[PDB]
Ligand binder design. Sequence first.
Ligand code: IAC
Ligand code: IAC
Lengths: 128, 128
Amino acid sequence: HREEFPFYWIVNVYARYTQIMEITLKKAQLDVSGFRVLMVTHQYGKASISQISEYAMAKMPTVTKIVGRLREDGLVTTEVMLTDAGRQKVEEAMAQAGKVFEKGFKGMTRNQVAKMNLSLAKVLDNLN
Amino acid sequence: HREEFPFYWIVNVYARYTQIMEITLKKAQLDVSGFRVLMVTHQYGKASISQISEYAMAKMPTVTKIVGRLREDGLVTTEVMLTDAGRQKVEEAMAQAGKVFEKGFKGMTRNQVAKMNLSLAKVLDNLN
Ligand SMILES: O=C(O)Cc1c[nH]c2ccccc12
Ligand SMILES: O=C(O)Cc1c[nH]c2ccccc12
């Protein structure tokens, strides 16, 4: 097979990555959406559905059904919402994901990884 | 929001890309799976489900249900399968996708795009 397809590796890294994070986070009782929604709220501290909905990679009616599973499970509480022993869920989650990122970027320099992410961010400006 | 997440841009380029290709290929009567299954067969000329199933980003029972929609629509025929006026479907498809790739990589050098895809292929070796 040929890369006559400039997005071949975006897609393949994305699929192998999603696959690994599905089974890793099932250790920590989470799916990827659940894990993204917690992390957006974590950086914001207290977040709106509109704001989560920007970054979690989901239209607001998924986020609202996601945030409501996480309300009911004592990981988020509080319009605006905030983390609880979610703060412990995100330690658990990022410990697992840190193993995934460590394996992922092994043998790659800091500058390689930065130039890759700079180039990818130019692809996104262009698609937007 | 912070990239304390080295895959933030893989995922965002992947989501904006999938979004654009969904609506572009609906011009040409195709979804992305249909478009990938045709292209794998095209490079192979005549391909098995096992072989398509490697590259199309789908487990074999999707590919087998995908190849059967494309059998029934005169885009693939022939164990092994091959393109027809599929050969015309792939001109139509890659014309559209070439507009997507042209916009995508605008203002980026050939070497930038190659180094990005080399780095991404190291991420995949590592995840595999
Ligand atoms: O979707 C893309 O452009 C990348 C890609 C991954 N697998 C493919 C198989 C056939 C055609 C393109 C792709
Ligand atoms: O899935 C990833 O690792 C990337 C990513 C995209 N949006 C996110 C929101 C919160 C946490 C991580 C991500």
